[PDB]
Design a protein that fits this description.
The structure is a homodimer.
Chain A lengths: L2 H9 L5 H6 L6 E7 L16 H4 L1 E5 L8 E10 L2 H7 L7 H7 L4 H4 L5 E3 L5 E7 L11 E4 L2 E2 L18 E2 L12 E5 L3 E3 L6 H5 L2 H12 L11 E4 L5 H12 L3 E6 L2 H10 L3 E4 H4 L12 H15 L4 E6 L3 H10 E9 L7 E5 H5 L4 E4 L5 H12 L7 E6 L3 H9 L6 E5 L12 H11 L6
Parallel strand pairs in A: 11-12, 11-14, 12-13, 14-15, 15-17, 18-19
Antiparallel strand pairs in A: 1-2, 1-4, 3-5, 3-9, 3-19, 5-6, 6-10, 7-8
Helix pairs in contact in A: 4-16, 8-9, 8-15, 12-13
Catalytic activity (chains A, B): butanoyl-CoA + NADP(+) = (2E)-butenoyl-CoA + NADPH + H(+)
Enzyme class (chains A, B): oxidoreductase
Organism (chains A, B): Streptomyces collinus
C-alpha cells in the first residue's frame, strides 16, 4: 500500500533517481497469476470452451529477492499476448512443469518455483532497483522491455543471441511477469521508453513488433530492401500489422491478405494499396486433409501478379503454416525467400520442393529477436517510423476479461492492461511529436 | 572419313590452332538420339521395367548451322546422367514437347526442333569452330563443358546466372548433346580441361560436381566452413560422392549416410570416418503413407551425436526428399542449414516447422551451378583437390547399355562414355600430377 508513494514519484515531474532509490519497497503488490493447484481445472474441455476468466487471479504477492544482472521495475502498463492466454488455459502443458525443472539448478532459479505464477511478457514503466553487476540502468529510468531471457553461458549465442541453447521467454518460462504492479527482469531486457507514447501504447508493440523486425528487416531474416514485393499473411492484425508497417517504412510494396472488407480497410488506413481477400476470392488451397490444390496456388499467384503488374513475390511473410505454406512457396519469385515464425493453422508443413530447388528459393526460420534487433525495433517506434497498434485497454483487475478478449480474437490490434497507471492517456513526455503522429498511433482503436 | 581426320589432329602433339581451324567439318557425325515417333513406346509399363536399351539410337546426323556465342566441339568423351536416362524413357513427358515450343521463338532455336533428340549433358573434347562474338576460345582448345544454357537477356541472372528466367539444361532442353562425336554448345559453357586426367575422367564430374559445389561450398548454398558437421545422404553415389570430397577437402567432418557396408568402404577410402548405414540400422522415418515417426528422427539424431561426440548437424546435404526430409530438419543444429537440390524419393516434402522456426534453421534450395561456380568446381579438380569418380567406360555404340546401368543403378561411380576416343586412357598431358593422385582418381573403378 506504500505502492501509492511509488506511483506518486513516477507521476511527479521533479522526482530524481535519488528519490527513486529512496522509495521504500512495498511488502506486497497486486499481480495477475495462475495457481499451481488449479492446472487440471479444464479437464475434458475443448480448447475454445476454456475460459481464462476462471483461471486468472489477482493476488497480493511478495517482492522477489533481487539477484545479479537484474532489475525490479514499477510497471505502469503491460499487454496480453497469445502466450499469456495459453498459460491461462494451461496448454499444451502447465507452465509450472518447466518452472519446477528450471527451479532445481540454483537458489536463484528456485525463486521462480512458487505455488503461483505471475504472467505477462510486455512492460512499460520505470526502474526501482538494480542488482549486482548492473551499471547501464539507474532507478527512475522510463523503460520498456523485450521478453527474451538468456544467461548466455554457452558460446552458441555470442554471434546472435537467439541461438542460445536455453533461451526462455520472460513471464512464460519465468515468474514475476509484467501483468503486475512490480516485475523482475534481466537488465539485458530493458529498452528506453518512447517519449511520445502513453504507458499502454509503449507496452503494446513489444513481442509482436520485434518478431516482425527480425523476420522481415534484419539480416537474420529476409533482409528486406526497398522495391521488394512482400506477401504478408494476416496483414490487418497482430504480427501482419507490424510487418505491413515495416514493408511500408522501408520502401517495399506489401501485398496484404485479409478475411473481410473491414480488415481490408484497416490495411488501407496503414497506407497499403494492394489487398487480397482470401474469403471473397474463396481460396481452397487444400483439396482435402491430405492433398493440396496446385490450381489454387496458380490462381492466388495470378491475383498477386495483377496487383504488382506482372511481378512475383520477393519475400513471403509466413506464420499461418500448413494451410498457406504450399501457396507461399509457389508464388515466391525465383531466388525469393519465405520467412516463417509460426504455424498457427498447423505445424506439419507440406510444400512442393521442385518449386523450391529449381527456383533457387529459400525458407528461413525466425523467432522473437535478439537484444539488438529488439532495441532496433523499439528504436524505430521512438523515431516515429513504426507505430503501436493498441486497440483496447483494460485495468489490472479486468485482465481475465482482457485475456478472454484475445482468446476469442475479438480485436485485431493489441489489448492493453494498465498495471500501476490509474487511468489511460498518461506517460507522454513529448507532446510535440505525439501531435505529429497521433492519427497513425490511433489507427487500431476499438478495431 | 572426314571425322577420322579431325581425330588425327587431336591425337597429334604437333597440331596447331591454325591446323584445327582449317579442318573440314563432316557432312554427318555419329550421335545418340531418341526418336519423336517412338515416345509412346514405354506403353503402360511401370518405371523400373522401362529399358533405355530399346529406345536409344545411334544415328548419322548432319552438323547444325553455327550461331553467335556458340562453338562446335569434337567430343572425345561424355557421361550418362540422370536427366539423360529420364529423357530416353520419356519421363515425366517427352523432351520433344519443350523443344517444339522452343523452336517457334527464334529461327536459331528452330535448329533444335528435329525428328531426333541428340542427348547428353557432359563433355570433354576440343574446340573446332566458334561463331560471331566469341574471342575467349580458339579452335584446338582442350575443353570440358558445363550444362547450363542461359541467354541472359533478362536482368534477373546478372547477380547470379542461375536466376535467369529462361535457364535451360544443355543436352536435355537443348539438342546436339554430349553423347556424340561433335556437340554444339554456348561458349559460356566451356572450361579448361584438367591436364592430368583422361578424356573420360574429365567428363565424369561435370553436372554432378558443379551441383554439389554451389549447394555446399558456395555463398549461394551452405557456405561451408572447416569444423562443420555435414550430413550427406547418398554419400557413396554420384552427388554425395562429390559432396563428401568437398566436405573433407574444406576441412569439415562428413557424416556419410549409406545403405550397404560396401558403400561404407567407398566413403572410408575417401577419408571419411563417421558413417551411418540406414539399412543396417533400420531407420523408418515414415510410420505410413501420411504420418511420420518423430521417434525415428530422434533415434537417428542420437546416432549422429554418438559419432560427432555430442554435436548436432551444421549442414545437411539433402536430395532424397520426402523420405528423409523431416529427419533432416529435425537433426540440424540450432541456427543450422538444410541444403536441397532434388527430391528423388518424392517432391512433396513434409517437415515440422516448430523445429525450423524455433531453432532458427533454414532450408536453402539450390540447383546446378552458374558459370563461376562451375569453373571453381572444375578448378578444384584441375588443382587435384577433388577427383573424378569414374566406375566404368562404354563405347559410343554401347550407350544404351550404359543408360540401362544408371537406371538399374548398378554402379556407385559416374558411368563414362567414349565418343570420338578410340580407347580408354588417352588425353593426359601432366603424367607427373596423374602419378601423385592416381589411387584417389581410381577409387570408384569397378565400383
Amino acid at each position: 500500500m506504500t505502492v501509492k508513494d511509488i506511483l506518486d514519484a513516477i507521476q511527479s515531474k521533479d522526482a530524481t533517481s535519488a528519490d527513486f532509490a529512496a522509495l521504500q519497497l512495498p511488502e506486497s503488490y497486486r499481480a495477475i497469476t495462475v495457481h499451481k493447484d488449479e492446472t487440471e481445472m479444464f479437464a475434458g474441455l475443448e480448447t475454445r470452451d476454456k475460459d481464462p476468466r476462471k483461471s486468472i487471479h489477482l493476488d497480493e504477492v511478495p517482492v522477489p529477492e533481487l539477484g545479479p544482472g537484474e532489475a525490479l521495475v514499477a510497471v505502469m502498463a503491460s499487454s496480453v499476448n497469445y502466450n499469456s492466454v495459453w498459460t491461462s488455459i494451461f496448454e499444451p502443458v502447465s507452465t509450472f512443469a518447466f518452472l519446477e525443472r528450471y527451479g532445481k539448478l540454483s537458489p536463484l532459479t528456485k525463486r521462480h518455483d512458487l505455488p503461483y505464477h505471475i504472467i505477462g511478457s510486455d512492460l512499460a514503466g520505470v526502474v526501482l532497483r538494480t542488482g549486482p553487476g548492473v551499471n547501464a540502468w539507474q532507478p527512475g529510468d522510463e523503460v520498456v522491455a523485450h521478453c527474451l531471457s538468456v544467461e548466455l553461458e554457452s558460446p552458441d549465442g555470442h554471434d546472435d543471441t537467439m541461438l542460445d541453447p536455453e533461451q526462455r521467454i520472460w513471464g512464460f518460462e519465468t515468474n514475476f511477469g509484467g501483468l503486475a504492479e512490480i516485475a523482475l527482469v534481466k537488465t539485458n531486457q530493458l529498452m528506453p521508453k518512447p517519449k511520445h507514447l502513453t504507458w499502454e501504447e509503449a507496452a503494446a508493440p513489444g513481442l509482436v513488433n520485434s518478431t516482425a523486425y527480425r523476420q522481415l528487416v534484419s539480416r537474420n531474416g529476409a533482409a528486406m530492401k526497398q522495391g521488394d514485393n512482400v506477401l504478408i499473411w494476416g496483414a490487418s492484425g497482430g504480427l501482419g500489422s507490424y510487418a505491413t508497417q515495416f514493408a511500408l517504412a522501408g520502401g517495399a510494396n506489401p501485398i496484404c491478405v485479409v478475411s473481410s472488407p473491414q480488415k481490408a480497410e484497416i490495411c488501407r488506413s496503414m497506407g497499403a494499396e494492394a489487398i487480397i481477400d482470401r474469403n471473397a476470392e474463396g481460396y481452397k488451397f487444400w483439396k482435402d486433409e491430405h492433398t493440396q490444390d496446385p490450381k489454387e496456388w496458380k490462381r492466388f499467384g495470378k491475383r498477386i501478379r495483377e496487383l504488382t503488374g506482372g511481378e512475383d513475390i520477393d519475400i513471403v511473410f509466413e506464420h499461418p503454416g500448413r494451410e498457406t505454406f504450399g501457396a507461399s512457396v509457389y508464388v515466391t519469385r525465383k531466388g525469393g525467400t519465405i520467412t516463417t515464425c509460426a504455424s498457427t493453422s498447423g505445424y506439419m508443413h507440406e510444400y512442393d520442393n521442385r518449386y523450391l530447388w529449381m527456383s533457387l528459393k529459400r525458407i528461413i526460420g525466425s523467432h522473437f529477436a535478439n537484444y539488438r534487433e529488439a532495441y532496433e525495433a523499439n528504436r524505430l517506434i521512438a523515431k516515429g517510423k513504426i507505430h503501436p497498434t493498441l486497440s483496447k485497454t483494460y485495468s489490472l483487475e479486468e485482465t481475465g476479461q482482457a485475456a478472454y478478449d484475445v482468446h476469442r480474437n475479438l480485436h485485431q490490434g493489441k489489448v492493453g492492461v494498465l498495471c500501476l497507471a490509474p487511468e489511460e492517456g498518461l506517460g507522454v513526455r513529448d507532446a510535440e511529436m505525439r501531435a505529429q503522429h497521433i492519427d497513425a498511433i490511433n489507427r487500431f482503436r476499438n478495431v
